[PDB]
Scaffold this active site. Structure first.
Site, mmCIF file in Angstrom:
data_model
loop_
_atom_site.group_PDB
_atom_site.id
_atom_site.type_symbol
_atom_site.label_atom_id
_atom_site.label_comp_id
_atom_site.label_asym_id
_atom_site.label_seq_id
_atom_site.Cartn_x
_atom_site.Cartn_y
_atom_site.Cartn_z
ATOM 1 N N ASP A 224 34.395 61.843 22.215
ATOM 2 C CA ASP A 224 34.637 60.976 21.068
ATOM 3 C C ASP A 224 35.570 59.818 21.368
ATOM 4 O O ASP A 224 35.494 58.786 20.694
ATOM 5 C CB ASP A 224 35.231 61.800 19.925
ATOM 6 C CG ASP A 224 34.294 62.883 19.461
ATOM 7 O OD1 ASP A 224 33.249 62.548 18.864
ATOM 8 O OD2 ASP A 224 34.547 64.065 19.754
ATOM 9 N N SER B 153 44.236 67.311 29.796
ATOM 10 C CA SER B 153 45.278 68.003 29.047
ATOM 11 C C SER B 153 46.338 67.048 28.536
ATOM 12 O O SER B 153 47.007 67.353 27.545
ATOM 13 C CB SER B 153 45.998 69.011 29.939
ATOM 14 O OG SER B 153 45.221 70.170 30.160
ATOM 15 N N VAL C 111 34.502 68.740 16.637
ATOM 16 C CA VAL C 111 35.895 68.494 16.969
ATOM 17 C C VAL C 111 35.993 67.192 17.760
ATOM 18 O O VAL C 111 34.988 66.579 18.117
ATOM 19 C CB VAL C 111 36.537 69.696 17.702
ATOM 20 C CG1 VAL C 111 36.407 70.963 16.849
ATOM 21 C CG2 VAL C 111 35.902 69.893 19.070
ATOM 22 N N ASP D 107 36.880 48.387 26.867
ATOM 23 C CA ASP D 107 37.936 47.950 27.772
ATOM 24 C C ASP D 107 38.122 48.839 28.997
ATOM 25 O O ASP D 107 38.862 48.451 29.911
ATOM 26 C CB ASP D 107 39.255 47.817 27.008
ATOM 27 C CG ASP D 107 39.196 46.733 25.945
ATOM 28 O OD1 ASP D 107 39.797 46.915 24.870
ATOM 29 O OD2 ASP D 107 38.545 45.695 26.188
ATOM 30 N N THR E 39 46.744 46.153 22.471
ATOM 31 C CA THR E 39 45.407 45.647 22.769
ATOM 32 C C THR E 39 45.200 45.323 24.245
ATOM 33 O O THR E 39 44.098 44.896 24.615
ATOM 34 C CB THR E 39 45.103 44.400 21.933
ATOM 35 O OG1 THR E 39 46.181 43.465 22.059
ATOM 36 C CG2 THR E 39 44.920 44.767 20.464
ATOM 37 N N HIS F 71 53.117 73.643 31.168
ATOM 38 C CA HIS F 71 51.986 72.859 30.677
ATOM 39 C C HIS F 71 52.059 72.652 29.163
ATOM 40 O O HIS F 71 51.923 71.522 28.674
ATOM 41 C CB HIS F 71 50.699 73.562 31.117
ATOM 42 C CG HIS F 71 49.429 72.871 30.735
ATOM 43 N ND1 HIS F 71 48.784 73.129 29.545
ATOM 44 C CD2 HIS F 71 48.635 72.007 31.412
ATOM 45 C CE1 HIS F 71 47.664 72.430 29.491
ATOM 46 N NE2 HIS F 71 47.552 71.735 30.609
ATOM 47 N N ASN G 157 38.365 68.527 33.433
ATOM 48 C CA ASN G 157 38.810 67.804 34.622
ATOM 49 C C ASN G 157 37.866 67.973 35.806
ATOM 50 O O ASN G 157 38.301 68.023 36.959
ATOM 51 C CB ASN G 157 40.211 68.240 35.042
ATOM 52 C CG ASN G 157 41.225 68.106 33.939
ATOM 53 O OD1 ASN G 157 41.171 67.174 33.141
ATOM 54 N ND2 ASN G 157 42.176 69.034 33.899
ATOM 55 N N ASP H 268 48.418 76.731 23.692
ATOM 56 C CA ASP H 268 48.628 76.483 25.110
ATOM 57 C C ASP H 268 49.472 77.603 25.718
ATOM 58 O O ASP H 268 49.353 78.767 25.301
ATOM 59 C CB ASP H 268 49.291 75.107 25.264
ATOM 60 C CG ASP H 268 48.943 74.439 26.565
ATOM 61 O OD1 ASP H 268 49.455 74.881 27.611
ATOM 62 O OD2 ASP H 268 48.191 73.438 26.547
ATOM 63 N N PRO I 123 30.431 69.801 18.797
ATOM 64 C CA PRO I 123 30.281 68.454 18.223
ATOM 65 C C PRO I 123 31.291 68.104 17.147
ATOM 66 O O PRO I 123 31.649 66.925 17.031
ATOM 67 C CB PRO I 123 28.845 68.455 17.677
ATOM 68 C CG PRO I 123 28.142 69.499 18.469
ATOM 69 C CD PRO I 123 29.169 70.560 18.748
#
Length: 279
Positions: free
Chosen positions: A200, A224, A177, A260, A16, A69, A161, A39, A175
């Site tokens: 999301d 990523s 996913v 936060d 938290t 990656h 990015n 990937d 939308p």
């Protein structure tokens, strides 16, 4: 369970508050779930994967990760030291070449591959796919991601990015996913993270230590890196029976740390992925 001196992002997803370094999680650890990492591949021989990783598909001359990656992202999903879901099964699908590039037609084929291939795997607790990739808007790319999700796979995708609205990128803008932005260890939006109403959730994305090729490790940054935190979290929560592939993104948002993060643009969710584990 407690992992001391964990990477900050693992500690963050079980806390938290920022500023701690122990990762707390239920010992089930994603056992019985499966995560596809779509990937550059996965160095499955890395000791950190413990035999739980394998390449299942490539569209290039090798299934090996000649970039790093994909191995880094897979490590954040499920490596023993650097992973969220330390007992999940990892499946690599190499849609990106060793320079990190891939055609949208290949990426689409890889998503449809996973939607079918899960029927060839044993994943009684559920199936997740982690997509740390993207480019400009494409309805066909978004539709492929939507199909993969519809088929019963929790799809987590990088927001991108560009420090821009993710509505203009794919599969980020689909939308249905789970679109993942990046934060840093001080609970700031990562400087490069895309934003917008299509996001999301946020996960740790700045200065993330994980596996690399050549049996090595390194710390790198990106959406990523945030995406596999969320993918691993989904697998972990599915193993616990708390959610399903179709509902996990919403569940993660429901249970997130709220309000936060700093530098969240007006209209973007202020939600940070959190496992709600009570030791």
């Amino acid at each position: 369970a407690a992992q001391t001196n964990a990477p900050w992002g693992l500690a963050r997803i079980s806390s938290t508050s920022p500023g701690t370094s122990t990762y707390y999680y239920d010992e089930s650890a994603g056992q019985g779930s499966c995560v596809y990492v779509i990937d550059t591949g996965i160095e499955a021989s890395h000791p950190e994967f413990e035999g739980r990783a394998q390449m299942v598909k490539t569209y290039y001359y090798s299934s090996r990760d000649g970039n790093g990656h994909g191995t880094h992202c897979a490590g954040t999903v499920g490596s023993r030291t650097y992973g969220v879901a330390k007992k999940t099964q990892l499946f690599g699908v190499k849609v990106l070449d060793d320079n990190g590039s891939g055609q949208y037609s290949t990426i689409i084929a890889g998503m449809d591959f996973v939607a079918s291939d899960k029927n060839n795997r044993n994943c009684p607790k559920g199936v997740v796919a982690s997509l740390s990739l993207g480019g400009g808007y494409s309805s066909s790319v978004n539709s492929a991601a939507a199909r993969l999700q519809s088929s019963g796979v929790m799809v987590a995708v990088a927001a991108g990015n560009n420090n821009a609205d993710a509505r203009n990128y794919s599969p980020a803008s689909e939308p249905s996913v789970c679109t993942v932005g990046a934060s840093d260890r001080y609970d700031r939006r990562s400087s490069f993270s895309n934003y917008g109403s299509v996001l999301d959730i946020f996960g740790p994305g700045t200065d993330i230590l994980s596996t690399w090729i050549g049996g090595s490790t390194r710390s790198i940054s990106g959406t990523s890196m945030a995406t596999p935190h969320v993918a691993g979290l989904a697998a972990y929560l599915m193993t616990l029976g708390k959610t399903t592939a179709a509902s996990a993104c919403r569940y993660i948002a429901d249970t997130a740390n709220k309000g936060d993060l700093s530098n969240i643009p007006f209209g973007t969710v202020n939600l940070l992925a959190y496992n709600n584990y009570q030791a």
